[PDB]
Amino acid sequence: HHHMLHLLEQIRAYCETCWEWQEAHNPMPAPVEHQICPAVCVLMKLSFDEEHRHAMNELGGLQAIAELLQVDCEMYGLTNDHYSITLRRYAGMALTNLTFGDVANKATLCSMKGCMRALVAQLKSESEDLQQVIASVLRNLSWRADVNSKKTLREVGSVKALMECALEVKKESTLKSVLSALWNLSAHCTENKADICAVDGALAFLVGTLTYRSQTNTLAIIESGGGILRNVSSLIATNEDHRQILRENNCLQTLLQHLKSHSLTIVSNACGTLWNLSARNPKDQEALWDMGAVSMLKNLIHSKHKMIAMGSAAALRNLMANRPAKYKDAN
């Protein structure tokens, strides 16, 4: 543990020298001249081990690594070199590991508003790998976030930045982290839901994730994409333009097909989405009737899973109370 203690001292000393340069306004400190990259690389690697993490927390490892990432972003911005990119990647990975399951660490990092702004800015880095790392941090922070953390996550603009980021990522690994963070954020409040729906192209993109073809034989993208959609579907139900985006990217039929998934996550998401979209709109009701939605939702009403049971029943009630004019034996 005194290797760890030594590396953290290196990082704190470097930060202090950066803070002195900032407050002066001594040349501008350069992380390369203080061998910062190796120091954070090693800490990042130790952060994967549970015992080493606990040692690291006694030394305020989270605080110090966050302070380093923050000060480097402030000093050099996104007009930074590969040394800086690398440093931020390794710092970001450590922050991901240190925030995982850790109530105190999540609260500390979300209280660091400057650091939070720095993190969000990194979603436009030239390194898509760095975007994935930062989205992994934001995912942990948005999971079981307290009231102050929810407030800071929203006020630093993480939702719009993550949704915009999602539209530009190429790799499935980046998309998974980005969509997972958005799924967590989309449950926090109604403003987060509105901010997602307001990004041009987001609703169509999200519908596209419902039929994602994973190379890695997993459902992660479909689950998160569908979870985001279920969370924002309350507002989509109020906006005819947004409903139309869903219709013309084949959202309704795909949601009915999700009701057969082995993933209870996929089934629950789809039931929740169908619950909200089956309300009021007679043309969406008729479309669902015509696709056999009634018997499909009826098959799920005795689920042990509380949300599948309630959602499937609620959707069914909406349809049964609004049998289309054409069905009435006819006419």
Binding site: F48, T96, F100, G101, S136, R139
Partner: peptide, 7 residues
């Protein structure tokens, strides 16, 4: 979506 370690 939950939380996870870096991967």
């Amino acid at each position: 979506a939950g939380e996870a370690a870096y991967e």
